[PDB]
Structure 1
Amino acid sequence: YAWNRTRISNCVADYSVLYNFAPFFAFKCYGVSPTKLNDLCFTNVYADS
């Protein structure tokens, strides 16, 4: 009801690290495929937790 928003910027991403933090129930992307996020992550990035 009071979800958190973290702003991600001025970084180099690297999304393979996200497979180390936890096993996932779901990892569903819209407009981009899971396999290509290392590139194509751009503009405002926000993590809704």
Structure 2
Amino acid sequence: YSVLYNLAPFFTFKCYGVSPTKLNDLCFTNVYADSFVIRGDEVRQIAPG
């Protein structure tokens, strides 16, 4: 939680779900990290619901 953040200038870390302040007290069995690239204002399309 410290190598992917506070290395570059600020990212667009605006998301709904798990709290950024709750990342230091949460246990998860498995994580599915998928990476992709989009164009322009399609960030809103990547959202639950």
Q: TM-score, normalised by structure 1?
A: 0.42
Of structures 1 and 2, the one scoring higher in RCO (CA 8 A, sep 6+) is 1
Q: TM-score, normalised by structure 2?
A: 0.42
Q: Report the structure, 1 or 2, having the larger helix content.
A: 1
**Greater Cα radius of gyration, structure 1 or 2:** 2
